[PDB]
C-alpha cells in the first residue's frame, strides 16, 4: 500500500520534479553518507587498546572519561583526503552538522507532501522545448510524463466518471 | 492460497539453524565467567 | 616436531622462507610481461566487443559451420 | 589483413602510451628539481 | 575470547590444520558435486532431447559432465538420444561415484592432518618457528597447474587421449562430443571457435610451466617482498580472491553472451538470440528456399525440424524468468509435447499479417498485427467502444502450415485471438501442464541461474579482496592506531613528505 | 636514491591537495568524467540516440539536461573515439552517444583511483583503512547500475543517462518493468539508507544535547578543543536517557560508530545485488499464489494487484517514446485505461 | 616569499577557467530564439 | 599551513584583481562567442531550432546501425539540404 | 606430541545474541513471503 | 574556421595580460628552485 | 500455514523485545 | 597585498552570482525552453 501511494502521488503531483522532495533525497542520501563517513572516521582512528584476538570494542569501557579515538588523526586523514579546510576538527560542529543535514532535508520533504496536499505540484516542463516550426522536441521531462500518464489512467480504474481527476 | 509447500521448511530452517548457532555460542560464553 | 619420511623428502622445498633477491631484482622484466599481457587482454576484449574487427574472425555462432 | 579497426587500435595504443609517457616525463622532471631536503 | 567472525584465524600459523581445513572444504565440494549429480540423475527425463532437453528440466551439473564428454548412463541411454550405448565406467553414475569416494578419502586425510598438525616440514629449519615459503610454493603449484592445463588441452580436448568436448552447429541442432583440433591463427581468440579453447590450454599451459620454473628458481625482489608482505599468508588470500572474482566475471559474461564453452544444447538459448531473431531468420531462410525449390506452403514448413522451431520461442529465452519463480522451466509453461505448426494470419482482404513479438523486457504485451510494411492492420483492443482494428471488424483468420495443426484454418474470432496471444511468444507449442502441475509463468534457464549466481558471487568476492588486502597492508594497526601518534605527524606542513619523519624543516 | 623514490618523494609531499601515486589515476579520470558531463549537458544532443533534446544549448534546464546513453543499435560497444563507430570524428562521436561511455568508464577508473587515495593517505597517516572499506558501497552501486545492469540487457541504451530527470525516468522504468519496489534487496537498501539517515540525525542530536559544560558562553561550539583527552559529551547520561525513552541504548562508543559504518554500507551492498538480478530480468515481479487466486476469483483484490495495473499503464504509455528503436505503434484502442481517464 | 605557481594554482585554474567560459556560453544561450 | 599563499590574501590583493578583471571577462566573452558565432553547433553536431526535422518530416532520424551509424546521420543531415 | 597451542576460546555476549536473533527473525519475516510465493 | 580565432582571441589577450603583470614575480620563484 | 508462520515470527520478535529491554546486560560504569 | 577589504569582494561577487542566475531564470521564460 505504501508503494501504491507513492506511485499515485507521482502521477498526480510529479513529486520527483518537486524541489522539496529533491531536498529529501539529499537529506537522506547525505545522511546515509555522513553516517558512513563519521562511523568510518572514528572507527579508523580508534586507539590501540586490545589485541588481535579480541573485539576492539572492548577498548572502550562505558563511562570512561578519556575519548576512545584520536580526532586529530581523523582530521589529518580526512583533511588530506579532500583538503584541510573541508574537514572538521571541532567535534561539536561535526556532530551538529550530522544532526542538521538529515533533519532539515526531511523537514523539507515533509513540507513537500504537506504542500502538494494543496496541489502545488512539481515543475512541469511538458512540451517546453519546441523547434522553429513548433514541433514538440521531447526531453526527459516528456518521457517522465508518459510514465505519469500510464499511472494516471490506470489508478482506481473504476472510480472516475468524468475526464479530470481533480482530487 | 496455492503457496509453495517447501516455503514452510525453508522458513523454519532459515530461522532455526542460524538462531541455534547463536544460542550455542552464548550459553557456552556464560559458562566461562 | 614430528619427522616423517615424506617430510624429509619435501624438506628443501620449504627451507628458504624469507630469502629475497636484492633491490629491484627482476621487477623491470615483470613489468614488460605485465604490459604485454594488458595489450593482449585489450585485443581479446575488443574482439569480443567488436571494436576490433579482423579478417576471418567472425564473432558469431556461425563460426561453428 | 590490416583492417581499419586494427589501425584504429594502434592509433589508440600509441595515443595512450604518448599520454602516459608524457605524464611520467613531466613528473620525473619536477620531482628532480623540487626534492625534499633531509 | 575470539568473536564469532574470527574463529578461523586460529589456522593462520598452523599449516597442518590449515591443510586439514582445506582438505575438509575440498571433501565437501566434491561431495556436493556427487550428491547433485545423483539427484539430477534421479529426476532427469532422457526420453526427448528435442523438446524436453536437460536445460528445460533444471539440470545444472549434467551439462558440465556432458560438456567434457560424459554423455551416457549405465541405464543404456545417452543425452544425444541414442539408445543401447555402453559408456564404460565413466557414465554419469560413475562420475558421481568417483566424487563421492573422493569426498570420503579427502575426509580421512583431513582427520590425519588435523591430528598430526605438528610436522617438522612446516618449521623453518633456522628459527624453529612455523613458516611457509610462499614464493616457492607459488612456483611449484603454478608448475603443476601448467602441466595439467597443458595436458588437458593437448590430450583430453584433442582426443589424442580423451573424448574431446561438446561442439555443435550454429543453430544447436546436431551437437555431440568430438575431438577438436587447435586453432592457432587469430580466429582462435574468437569465443565462438572451439579450436581456440584447445590452443589456449596448450599455449597457456606451456607458459605456466615456464613461469612455474621461473618462480621455483628465482627469489622475489626485496622491494616486492616488502611491498606485498610476502611473508604474510593473507597477502595470498587477497590476490587469490581478486583472481577468483576476475574469473567469475568472465564466466558469468560468457554464459550470458554465449561462447564455444556454453553451447545452447546444454544450457539453452541466450536472450540475444531472441533479441536478434536469430533462429527466426534461419527458419525463414529454409522456408523461402523450400519454396524456391517449388514446395507447397505445407511442404516448406513441415520441413522445419521441431527442435529449431522450439528455439524460436520466448519461453526458452533466459531473460523471461523471476528470482523467486523456482524450479525447472517445465514447471512454468509445462513440458513441450509438439510443435503445433507455424501460424499465418490474414485479414478479410487476404493480406498476410504478422504478430508483433513480445520483447524480453515486458511481462505482458498487447496483441498487435502488422502487414509486411509495419502498418497496424489489426489488434486485440482494450477499450471496445472506439475500436477500429478488432479481429471481428478485420476478419482475421489463422492458418497453420507444418506441425500438428498443418493445413488447418480457423476463422471463429475467439479461437483466432487465442493463437494470436500465443504468437507473440514466437512459434506455438503444445504443452503438458498437468504432469508437473505447471502454473503458466515463465522461469529462467540454467544459463540464467548460473549467470546470476556467478555475477553475485563475483561482486561479493570483490569486497573480500578489499577487506583482506586492507588487512594485509594495515596489519600493524588492525587493533588500533598507535596510542602515541603525535599531532605533528598529522598536522599540516610539519613534514615535507607525509608520514616520513625524516623530512622536517 | 633512484628516480622511483625521487618521484614517490614528490607525489607524497604535504600540500594543499595531496597527490600520491593514486593521484595519477584519480585526477585525470575524475576531471574527465566531470568535464564530459558538463560538456554534454551544456552542448550535446540526444536527438540521434533518443529523439530527445538534452543540453542547455537546445533549451533544456538543469533538471532536464543529461548526457544520454548510446542508441540501442550500438549494443555494448565501448564506443571508443577511434573505434569503428565514430572513426575518429569527434562530432559524430558526440552524436552517437560516445560521451556516455567516456563518462561511465573514466568515472569507474576515478572511483578506483579515489578508493586507492583513501588507501594511500590512510597508510601515510597511520590510521586504519575503514573509510576506504566503507567506500566499497558506492562502488558496488555504481558498477552494478551503470555497468552490470545494461551489460545484462541488449545495450547501454537501457543504463541510466547522466541527468536529473533522466534518472527520474530510470526510477519509473524500474517500477513498471521490474517492479523493483517489491524486491527484498531494494527494501534492504531502503532500510540501510533510511536507517543511516536516522542514525546520523539521532547521533548528532544526542551528542549536542548531552554536552558537558566546558565554557561559559551560550555558543557551546567554543568549548571543544581538538586535542583535549576528555569526552565532550556524556555517554552515561546519553545512555540513561535512551534506555528510558526507547528501552535500549548504546553503551559502547566503539560499537556505535562501527554500527554507523555498517548500516548504510550493508544496505547499499544489498541493493547492488538486486540490480544484478535485474541485469538478467530476474525480478521479484509477482507472487504466484496471488495471481492464481486473482485469475480464478474476480472479487479478490489487494494492493499487490493494484500496483501491477499501474505498472501495466506505465509500460504501455511510456514504451514507444522511451524505446524509439522498437517502433512500437500502439493504436488508441489497445492502451490500458480505467474509466473516463 | 610565497610561490605563485603551485599544484594548487593548477587545480584551481583547471576548474575555474572553463567554468567562466561555460557561464559565458550559457549566458548567450538565454538569448537564442526559435 | 602547507606553505602556499592564503586564498584570503590573494583575492584581496590588488595585483590579483589587476589580472583577473581581464581574464574573467575575456573567458566569459570567449564562451559567449562560441555560442553567438554558431561554432558550438558545428563542433558538437547539435541541431539548430530549424534542423531537427525536415519541413514535412515527423520521423526521428534515429541511428539504427552500429557500423554504418556515422553514414546514417550524414544521410539524415543531407535530407535537410 | 604437544597439544595444539593455537586453540582459542570463542565469545558471544548477550547483546550480540539479541542483535543476531533480531537480524535472523527480521530476515525471516522479510523473505518468508517470497519463499511461499 | 574563422569563428575559432574569434573565440580564442579574448583568451590569448587574457593570457597575454597575465603574462606581463606576473612575469617579474614569477621569475623570482624559478631562480629559487635551486 | 503461511498465516501461522508469519504471526509466529512476529510473536518471536515481540518476545525478543521484552528480553532485550528487561533482561539486558546492565551497563556498568568504568 | 591585502588592500581590498574582503567584505567588498564578497558583496560584488555576491551580486555577480545573482545577476547570472537571474539571467538563467529570465531565460526559462524567453526563447528556447519557454514553451512558446
Ligand atoms: C532513489 C530514489 C528515492 C529516494 C532516495 C527517495 C527518498 C524519499 N522519498 Mg521519494 N519517491 C521515489 C524515489 C525516491 N525517494 C519515487 C520513485 C517516487 C514515486 C513513485 C517517490 C515518491 C515519494 C512519496 C510519495 C513520498 C516519498 C517520500 C520520501 C522520503 C521517504 C523517507 C521519509 O519520508 O522519512 C520520513 C520519516 C518517516 C516517515 C518516519 C516516521 C516514523 C514515525 C514518527 C514513528 C514510527 C514508529 C513505528 C511504527 C514503530 C517502531 C517501533 C518498533 C519497536 C517497531 C525520502 C526523502 C515520502 C516523504 O517525503 O514523506 C514526507 C513520501 O510521502 N517519496
Ligand atoms: C581427480 C580429478 C577430477 C576430475 C577428472 C574431475 C572431473 C569433473 N568434475 Mg570434479 N572435482 C574434483 C576433481 C576432479 N573432477 C575435486 C578435487 C573437486 C573438489 C574441489 C571437484 C569438484 C567438482 C564440482 C564442484 C563440480 C565438478 C564437476 C566435474 C565435471 C566437469 C569439470 C569441469 O568443468 O571443470 C571445470 C574446471 C575449470 C573451468 C577450472 C578452471 C581453472 C581456473 C581457470 C583456474 C586456473 C588458475 C591457474 C592457477 C592459473 C594457471 C596459469 C596458466 C598460465 C596455466 C568433470 C566430470 C562438475 C560436475 O559436473 O559435477 C558433477 C561440478 O559442478 N567437480
Ligand atoms: C551456483 C549455484 C547453483 C546454481 C546456479 C543452481 C541452479 C539450479 N538449481 Mg541447484 N543447488 C545448488 C546450487 C546451485 N543450483 C546447491 C548448492 C544446492 C544444494 C542446496 C542445490 C540444490 C538443488 C535442488 C534440490 C534443486 C536445484 C535446482 C536448480 C534449478 C532451479 C534453481 C532455483 O529455483 O533457484 C532458486 C533461487 C532462489 C530462490 C534465490 C535464493 C537466494 C536467496 C534469496 C539469498 C538469501 C539472501 C540472504 C538471506 C541475504 C542476507 C544478507 C545480509 C543479512 C548480510 C537451477 C538449474 C532445482 C531443479 O530444478 O533441479 C531439478 C532443484 O529442485 N538445485
Ligand atoms: C577463499 C575465500 C576466503 C577465505 C579463505 C577467507 C578467510 C577468512 N576471512 Mg574472509 N572474506 C571472503 C573470503 C574468504 N575469507 C569474502 C569473499 C568476503 C566478503 C564477504 C570476506 C569477508 C570477510 C570479513 C569481513 C572478515 C573475514 C574474515 C576472515 C577470517 C575469519 C573468518 C571466520 O572465522 O569466519 C567465521 C564465520 C562464521 C562463523 C559463519 C559465517 C556464516 C556465513 C555468513 C554464512 C554461511 C554461508 C554458507 C556456509 C555457504 C558458503 C558460501 C559459498 C560461497 C560457498 C579468515 C582468515 C574476518 C577477519 O578478517 O578476521 C580477522 C573478517 O572480519 N572475511
Ligand atoms: C523510500 C524511498 C527510497 C529510498 C530510501 C531508496 C534508496 C535507494 N534506492 Mg530506491 N527507489 C525508490 C525509493 C527509494 N529508494 C522507488 C519508489 C523506486 C521506483 C522503483 C526506486 C528505484 C530505484 C532504482 C531504479 C535504483 C534505486 C537505488 C537505490 C539506492 C541508491 C544508492 C545510492 O546511494 O546511489 C547513489 C549512487 C552511487 C553511490 C553511485 C556512485 C556515487 C559516486 C561516488 C558519485 C560521485 C559524485 C562526484 C564526486 C561529483 C558529482 C558532482 C556533480 C553533480 C556536479 C538506495 C538503496 C539504486 C540501487 O539499488 O542501486 C544498487 C537504483 O539503481 N532505487
Ligand atoms: C547520489 C548520492 C551520492 C553522491 C552524489 C555521493 C557522492 C560522494 N560520496 C563520496 C564519498 C563517500 N560516499 C560514502 C558513502 C555513501 N555515499 C552515498 C551516496 C552518494 N555519494 C551513500 C548513500 C553512502 C552511504 C554508504 C562514503 C563512505 C564516502 C567517502 O569516503 C567519500 C567522501 O569523501 O565523502 C565526503 C565522494 C566521492 C568523491 C569522489 O569520488 O571524487 C572523485 C570523483 C570522481 C572519481 C568522479 C566520479 C564520476 C561519476 C562516478 C560518474 C559521472 C557523474 C557526473 C559528473 C554527474 C552526473 C549527475 C547526474 C547523474 C545528475 C562524493 C562527494
Ligand atoms: C544448512 C541448512 C539450512 C539452509 C537452508 C535454510 C533455508 C534457506 C532456504 C533458502 C532457499 C529458499 C528456497 C525457496 C524455494 C523452495 O522452497 O523451492 C525449492 C527449489 C527447487 O524448486 C522446486 O523444484 C521442484 C522440481 O525440481 C518443483 O519445480 C517445485 O515446484 C519447486 O519448488 O529449491 C532450489 O531451487 C534449490 C537450489 C537453489 C540454489 C540456487 C541459488 C543460486 C542463487 C545464488 C545467489 C546467492 C545469493 C546470495 C546473496 C547473499
Ligand atoms: C575553485 C574554483 C571553482 C570551481 C568551479 C567548478 C563548478 C562546477 C560545478 C558544476 C555545477 C552544475 C550546475 C550547472 C547549472 C546551470 O548551468 O544551469 C544552466 C541553466 C541555464 O538555463 C536554461 O538555459 C537555456 C538556454 O537555452 C534555456 O533558456 C532554459 O530555459 C533555461 O532553463 O540554468 C538553470 O537551469 C536554472 C538555474 C538553476 C541552476 C541549477 C541549480 C544548482 C544545482 C546544484 C548544482 C549541482 C550540485 C548538486 C550537489 C548535490
Ligand atoms: C594530452 C596530454 C596531457 C597529459 C599531460 C599532462 C601532464 C600533467 C602535469 C602534472 C604536473 C603539474 C603540477 C606541477 C606544476 C608546478 O607549478 O609545480 C612545480 C613548480 C611549482 O613551484 C613550486 O611549488 C612547490 C609547491 S607544489 O609542489 O606545487 O605543491 C614549491 O615546493 C616550490 O618552492 C615552488 O617553486
Ligand atoms: C567417509 C568415507 C566414504 C564416504 C563418503 C561420503 C558418504 C561422503 C558424502 C559427502 C556428501 C554427500 C557431501 C555433501 C555435501 C553438501 C554440501 C557441502 C552442500 C552445501 C550446500 C550449501 C553450501 C548451500 C548453500 C545455499 C543454500 C543452502 C541456499 C541457497 C543459497 C546457497 C547456495 C548459498 C567412502 C565410502 C568413500 C570411503 C571411506 C570414508
Ligand atoms: C569532454 C572531453 C574532453 C574534456 C573536456 C573537459 C575537461 C571539460 C571541462 C569542462 C568544465 C570544467 C566545465 C565547467 C563548467 C561549469 C559550469 C557551467 C558551472 C555552473 C555553475 C553554476 C551555474 C553555479 C551557480 C550556483 C547555483 C546554481 C546555486 C548555488 C550557487 C552557485 C553560484 C554555485 C576532452 C578535451 C579530453 C576531449 C574529449 C571530450
Ligand atoms: Cl490504484
Ligand atoms: Cl469522477
Ligand atoms: Fe560521534
- Domain containing residue C9: CATH number: 1.20.5.880
Method by which the model was determined = X-ray
Give yes or no for residue E5 CB within 6 A of ligand 4: yes
Helix (H, G, I), strand (E, B), or coil: what is residue A136?
strand
Annotated binding site of F: 106, 118, 131, 186, 203, 250, 257
Extract long-range pairs of E32-39: CB within 8 Å, 24+ residues apart: E33/E61, E33/E96, E33/E99, E34/E96, E34/E97, E34/E98, E34/E99, E34/E100, E34/E102, E34/E103, E35/E100, E36/E60, E36/E61, E37/E61, E37/E62, E37/E65, E37/E92, E37/E95, E37/E96, E37/E99, E38/E96
CATH class of E271-443: alpha beta
**Grid cell of E100 as nine digits:** 563421492
H52–A137 C-beta distance less than 8 A: yes
Cα of K20 from ligand 1 centre, angstroms: 28
Cα of E166 from ligand 5 centre, angstroms: 43
- Nearest CA-CA partner of B11 in F71, E26, K2: K2
For residues F150 and F72, give the distance between their C-alpha atoms in angstroms, rounded to a whole number.
11
| Angle separating helix axes F20-43 and F98-125, nearest 10 degrees | 150
Write down the domain spans for chain E: 1-270+444-505, 271-443
Residue F333 at interface with chain E, using a CB cutoff of 8 Å: yes
Give yes or no for residue A122 CB within 6 A of ligand 1: no
State the DSSP code for E401: E
Cα of E464 from ligand 4 centre, angstroms: 8
Residue H37 at interface with chain G, using a CB cutoff of 8 Å: no
For residues F313 and F317, give the distance between their C-alpha atoms in angstroms, rounded to a whole number.
6
Count of domains for chain F: 1
For residues A44 and F273, give the distance between their C-alpha atoms in angstroms, rounded to a whole number.
27
Cα of F182 from ligand 13 centre, angstroms: 30
**Grid cell of C34 as nine digits:** 605485465
List F46's β-bridge partners, or say none. Answer: F52
Cα of A167 from ligand 13 centre, angstroms: 9
Q: Which atom of ligand 8 is nearest to the CA of F60?
A: 30
Sequence-ordered list of residues with C-beta below 8 angstroms from that of E274, at least 6 positions apart, any chain: E314, E317, E319, E360, E426
- Nearest CA-CA partner of E406 in E301, E286, E279, E336: E301
Count of domains for chain C: 1
**Grid cell of E110 as nine digits:** 583431513
Q: Widest CA span of chain K, in angstroms?
A: 50
The minimum CA-CA distance between B1 and chain K, rounded to whole Å, is 9
Cα-based angle A123, A124, A126 (whole degrees, multiple of 5) = 150
| Chain D residues with CB within 8 Å of chain C CB | 1, 3-6, 8-9, 13
Residue L20 at interface with chain G, using a CB cutoff of 8 Å: yes
Rounded to a whole number of angstroms, the CA Rg of chain C reads 23
State the DSSP code for F65: -
What separation in angstroms does the CA of G7 have from each of F6, F16, F17, F35?
17, 8, 8, 19
For residues H37 and H42, give the distance between their C-alpha atoms in angstroms, rounded to a whole number.
10
Pocket test for ligand 6, best of F112, F113, F135 (most atoms within 8 A of CB): F135
Nearest CA in chain L to F57: L32
Nearest CA in chain A to L29: A128
E487–A72 C-beta distance less than 8 A: yes
Give yes or no for residue D36 CB within 6 A of ligand 9: no
List E177's β-bridge partners, or say none. Answer: E166
Question: Given a contact as 3+ CB pairs under 8 Å, which chains touch K?
Answer: A, B, F, I
SS3 content of chain J, % helix, strand, coil (to 5): 90, 0, 10
Which phi and psi (to 5°) does residue F102 adopt? -55, -50
Give yes or no for residue L22 CB within 6 A of ligand 8: no
Domain containing C20: what range?
Answer: 1-51
Query: C43 in a domain, yes or no?
Result: yes
**How far is C-alpha F233 from the geometric centre of its chain's CA atoms?**
35
For residues E39 and E62, give the distance between their C-alpha atoms in angstroms, rounded to a whole number.
10
Residue E83 at interface with chain F, using a CB cutoff of 8 Å: no
Give yes or no for residue E95 CB within 6 A of ligand 2: yes
For residues C51 and C65, give the distance between their C-alpha atoms in angstroms, rounded to a whole number.
24
Domain containing F295: what range?
Answer: 1-341
For residues F252 and H34, give the distance between their C-alpha atoms in angstroms, rounded to a whole number.
60
The minimum CA-CA distance between H15 and chain F, rounded to whole Å, is 22
Residue G13 annotated as lining a ligand binding site: yes
> E352: how many CB neighbours lie within 10 A of its CB?
13
Helix (H, G, I), strand (E, B), or coil: what is residue A14?
coil
Give yes or no for residue E457 CB within 6 A of ligand 3: no
Amino acid at each position: 500500500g505504501t508503494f501504491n501511494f507513492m506511485i499515485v502521488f507521482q502521477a498526480e503531483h510529479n513529486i520527483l520534479m518537486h524541489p522539496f522532495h529533491q531536498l529529501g533525497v539529499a537529506g537522506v542520501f547525505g545522511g546515509a553518507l555522513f553516517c558512513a563517513m563519521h562511523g568510518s572516521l572514528v572507527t579508523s582512528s580508534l586507539i590501540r587498546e586490545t589485541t588481535e584476538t579480541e573485539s576492539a570494542n572492548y577498548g572502550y569501557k562505558f563511562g570512561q572519561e578519556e575519548e576512545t579515538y584520536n580526532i586529530v588523526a581523523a582530521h589529518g586523514y580526512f583533511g588530506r583526503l579532500i583538503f584541510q579546510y573541508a574537514s572538521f576538527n571541532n567535534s561539536r560542529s561535526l556532530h551538529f552538522f550530522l544532526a542538521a543535514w538529515p533533519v532539515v532535508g526531511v523537514w523539507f520533504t515533509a513540507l513537500g507532501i504537506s504542500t502538494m496536499a494543496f496541489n502545488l505540484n512539481g515543475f512541469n516542463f511538458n512540451h517546453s522545448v519546441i523547434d522553429a516550426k513548433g514541433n514538440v522536441i521531447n526531453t526527459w521531462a516528456d518521457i517522465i510524463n508518459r510514465a505519469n500518464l500510464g499511472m494516471e489512467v490506470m489508478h482506481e480504474r473504476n472510480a472516475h466518471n468524468f475526464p479530470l481527476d481533480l482530487a | 492460497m496455492e503457496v509453495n509447500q517447501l516455503g514452510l521448511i525453508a522458513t523454519a530452517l532459515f530461522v532455526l539453524v542460524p538462531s541455534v548457532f547463536l544460542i550455542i555460542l552464548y550459553v557456552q560464553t556464560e559458562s566461562q565467567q | 616436531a614430528r619427522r616423517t619420511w615424506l617430510g624429509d623428502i619435501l624438506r628443501p622445498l620449504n627451507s628458504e622462507y624469507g630469502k629475497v633477491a636484492p633491490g629491484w631484482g627482476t621487477t623491470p622484466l615483470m613489468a614488460v610481461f605485465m604490459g604485454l599481457f594488458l595489450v593482449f587482454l585489450l585485443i581479446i576484449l575488443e574482439i569480443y566487443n567488436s571494436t576490433l574487427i579482423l579478417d576471418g574472425v567472425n564473432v558469431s555462432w556461425k563460426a561453428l559451420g | 589483413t590490416i583492417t581499419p579497426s586494427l589501425k584504429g587500435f594502434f592509433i589508440g595504443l600509441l595515443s595512450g602510451a604518448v599520454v602516459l609517457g608524457l605524464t611520467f616525463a613531466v613528473l620525473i622532471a619536477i620531482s628532480q628539481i623540487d626534492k625534499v631536503q633531509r | 575470547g575470539l568473536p564469532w567472525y574470527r574463529v578461523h584465524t586460529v589456522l593462520i600459523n598452523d599449516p597442518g590444520r590449515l591443510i586439514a581445513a582445506h582438505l575438509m572444504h575440498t571433501a565437501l565440494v566434491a561431495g556436493w558435486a556427487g550428491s547433485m549429480a545423483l539427484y539430477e540423475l534421479a529426476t532427469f527425463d532422457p526420453s526427448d532431447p528435442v523438446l524436453n532437453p536437460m536445460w528445460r528440466q533444471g539440470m545444472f551439473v549434467l551439462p558440465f559432465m556432458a560438456r567434457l564428454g560424459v554423455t551416457g548412463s549405465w541405464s543404456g541411454w545417452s543425452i544425444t538420444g541414442e539408445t543401447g550405448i555402453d559408456p564404460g565406467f565413466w557414465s554419469f553414475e560413475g562420475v558421481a561415484l568417483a566424487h563421492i569416494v573422493l569426498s570420503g578419502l579427502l575426509f580421512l586425510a583431513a582427520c590425519w592432518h588435523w591430528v598430526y598438525w605438528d610436522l617438522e616440514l612446516f618449521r623453518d629449519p633456522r628459527t624453529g618457528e612455523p613458516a611457509l615459503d610462499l614464493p616457492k610454493m607459488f612456483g611449484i603449484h603454478l608448475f603443476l597447474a601448467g602441466l595439467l592445463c597443458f595436458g588437458f588441452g593437448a590430450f583430453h580436448l584433442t582426443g589424442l587421449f580423451g573424448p574431446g568436448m561438446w561442439v555443435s552447429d550454429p543453430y544447436g541442432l546436431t551437437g555431440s562430443v568430438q575431438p577438436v583440433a587447435p586453432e592457432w591463427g587469430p580466429d582462435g581468440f574468437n569465443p565462438y571457435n572451439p579450436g581456440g579453447v584447445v590452443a589456449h590450454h596448450i599455449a597457456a599451459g606451456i607458459v605456466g610451466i615456464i613461469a612455474g620454473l621461473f618462480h621455483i628458481l628465482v627469489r622475489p625482489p626485496q622491494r616486492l617482498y616488502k611491498a606485498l608482505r610476502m611473508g604474510n599468508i593473507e597477502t595470498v588470500l587477497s590476490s587469490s580472491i581478486a583472481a577468483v572474482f576476475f574469473a567469475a566475471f568472465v564466466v558469468a559474461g560468457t554464459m550470458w553472451y554465449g561462447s564455444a564453452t556454453t553451447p545452447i544444447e546444454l544450457f539453452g538459448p541466450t536472450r540475444y538470440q531472441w533479441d536478434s531473431s536469430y533462429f527466426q531468420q534461419e527458419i525463414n531462410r529454409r522456408v523461402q528456399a523450400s519454396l524456391a525449390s517449388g514446395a507447397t506452403l505445407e511442404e516448406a514448413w513441415s520441413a522445419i525440424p521441431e527442435k529449431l522451431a522450439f528455439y524460436d520461442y520466448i519461453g526458452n529465452n533466459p531473460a523471461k524468468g523471476g528470482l523467486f519463480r523456482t524450479g525447472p522451466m517445465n514447471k512454468g509453461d509445462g513440458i513441450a509435447q509438439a510443435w503445433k505448426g507455424h501460424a499465418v494470419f490474414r485479414n478479410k482482404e487476404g493480406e498476410e499479417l504478422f504478430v508483433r513479438r513480445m520483447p524480453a523486457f515486458f511481462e505482458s504485451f498487447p496483441v498487435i498485427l502488422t502487414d509486411k510494411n509495419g502498418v497496424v492492420k489489426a489488434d486485440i483492443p482494450f477499450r471496445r467502444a472506439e475500436s477500429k482494428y478488432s479481429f471481428e471488424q478485420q476478419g482475421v483468420t489463422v492458418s497453420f502450415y507444418g506441425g500438428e495443426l498443418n493445413g488447418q484454418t480457423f476463422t471463429d474470432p475467439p479461437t483466432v485471438k487465442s493463437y494470436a496471444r500465443k504468437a507473440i511468444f514466437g512459434e506455438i507449442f503444445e504443452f503438458d501442464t498437468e504432469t508437473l502441475n505447471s502454473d503458466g509463468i515463465f522461469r529462467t534457464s540454467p544459463r540464467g541461474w548460473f549467470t546470476f549466481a556467478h555475477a553475485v558471487f563475483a561482486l561479493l568476492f570483490f569486497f573480500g579482496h578489499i577487506w583482506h588486502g586492507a588487512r594485509t597492508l594495515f596489519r600493524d594497526v588492525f587493533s588500533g592506531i598507535d596510542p602515541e601518534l603525535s599531532p605533528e605527524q598529522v598536522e599540516w606542513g610539519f613534514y615535507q613528505k607525509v608520514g616520513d619523519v625524516t623530512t622536517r624543516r | 636514491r633512484g628516480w622511483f623514490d625521487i618521484l614517490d618523494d614528490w607525489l607524497k609531499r604535504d600540500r594543499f591537495v595531496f597527490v600520491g601515486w593514486s593521484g595519477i589515476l584519480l585526477f585525470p579520470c575524475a576531471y574527465l568524467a566531470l568535464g564530459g558531463w558538463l560538456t554534454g549537458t551544456t552542448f550535446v544532443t540526444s536527438w540521434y540516440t533518443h529523439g530527445l533534446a538534452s543540453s542547455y544549448l537546445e533549451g533544456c534546464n538543469f533538471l532536464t539536461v543529461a548526457v544520454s546513453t548510446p542508441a540501442n543499435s550500438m549494443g555494448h560497444s565501448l564506443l571508443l573515439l577511434w573505434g569503428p563507430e565514430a572513426q575518429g570524428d569527434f562530432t559524430r562521436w558526440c552524436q552517437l552517444g560516445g560521451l556516455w561511455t567516456f563518462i561511465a568508464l573514466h568515472g569507474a577508473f576515478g572511483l578506483i583511483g579515489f578508493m586507492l587515495r583513501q588507501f594511500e593517505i590512510a597508510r601515510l597517516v597511520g590510521v586504519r583503512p575503514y573509510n576506504a572499506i566503507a567506500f566499497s558501497a558506492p562502488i558496488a552501486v555504481f558498477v552494478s547500475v551503470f555497468l552490470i545492469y545494461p551489460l545484462g540487457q541488449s545495450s547501454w541504451f537501457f543504463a541510466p543517462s547522466f541527468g536529473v530527470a533522466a534518472i527520474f525516468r530510470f526510477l519509473l522504468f524500474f517500477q513498471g518493468f521490474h517492479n523493483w519496489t517489491l524486491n527484498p534487496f531494494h527494501m534492504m537498501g531502503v532500510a540501510g539508507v533510511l536507517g543511516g539517515a536516522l542514525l546520523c540525525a539521532i547521533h548528532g542530536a544526542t551528542v549536542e544535547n548531552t554536552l558537558f559544560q566546558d565554557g561559559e558562553g551560550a555558543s557551546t561550539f567554543r568549548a571543544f578543543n581538538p586535542t583535549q583527552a576528555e569526552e565532550t559529551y556524556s555517554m552515561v547520561t546519553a545512555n540513561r536517557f535512551w534506555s528510558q525513552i526507547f528501552g535500549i541504548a548504546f553503551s559502547n562508543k566503539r560499537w556505535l560508530h562501527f554500527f554507523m559504518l555498517f548500516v548504510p554500507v550493508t544496505g547499499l551492498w544489498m541493493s547492488a545485488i538486486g540490480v544484478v538480478g535485474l541485469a538478467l530480468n530476474l525480478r521479484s515481479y509477482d507472487f504466484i499464489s496471488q495471481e492464481i487466486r486473482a485469475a480464478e476469483d474476480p472479487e479478490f483484490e489487494t494492493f499487490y494487484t493494484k500496483n501491477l495495473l499501474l505498472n501495466e499503464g506505465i509500460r504501455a504509455w511510456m514504451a514507444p517514446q522511451d524505446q524509439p528503436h522498437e517502433n512500437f505503434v500502439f493504436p488508441e484502442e489497445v492502451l490500458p485505461r480505467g474509466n473516463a481517464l | 616569499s610565497y610561490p605563485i605557481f603551485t599544484v594548487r594554482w593548477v587545480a584551481v585554474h583547471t576548474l575555474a577557467v572553463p567554468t567562466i567560459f561555460f557561464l559565458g556560453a550559457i549566458a548567450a544561450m538565454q538569448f537564442i530564439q526559435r | 599551513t602547507t606553505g602556499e599563499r592564503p586564498f584570503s590574501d590573494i583575492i584581496t590583493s590588488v595585483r590579483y584583481w589587476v589580472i583577473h578583471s581581464i581574464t574573467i571577462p575575456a573567458l566569459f566573452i570567449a564562451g559567449w562567442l562560441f555560442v553567438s558565432t554558431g561554432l558550438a553547433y558545428d563542433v558538437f553536431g547539435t541541431p539548430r531550432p530549424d534542423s531537427y526535422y525536415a519541413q514535412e518530416q515527423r520521423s526521428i532520424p534515429l541511428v539504427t546501425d552500429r557500423f554504418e551509424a556515422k553514414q546514417q546521420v550524414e544521410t539524415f543531415l543531407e535530407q535537410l539540404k | 606430541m604437544e597439544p595444539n597451542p593455537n586453540r582459542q576460546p570463542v565469545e558471544l555476549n548477550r547483546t550480540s545474541l539479541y542483535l543476531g536473533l533480531l537480524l535472523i527473525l527480521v530476515l525471516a519475516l522479510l523473505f518468508s513471503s517470497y519463499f511461499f510465493n | 574556421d574563422w569563428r575559432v580565432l574569434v573565440v580564442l582571441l579574448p583568451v590569448l589577450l587574457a593570457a597575454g595580460w597575465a603574462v606581463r603583470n606576473i612575469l617579474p614575480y614569477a621569475v623570482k620563484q624559478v631562480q629559487k628552485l635551486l | 500455514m503461511e498465516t501461522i508462520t508469519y504471526v509466529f515470527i512476529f510473536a518471536c520478535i515481540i518476545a525478543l523485545f521484552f528480553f532485550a529491554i528487561f533482561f539486558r546486560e546492565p551497563p556498568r560504569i568504568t | 597585498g591585502g588592500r581590498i577589504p574582503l567584505w567588498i569582494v564578497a558583496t560584488v561577487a555576491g551580486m555577480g552570482v545573482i545577476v547570472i542566475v537571474g539571467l538563467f531564470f529570465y531565460g526559462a521564460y524567453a526563447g528556447l525552453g519557454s514553451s512558446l
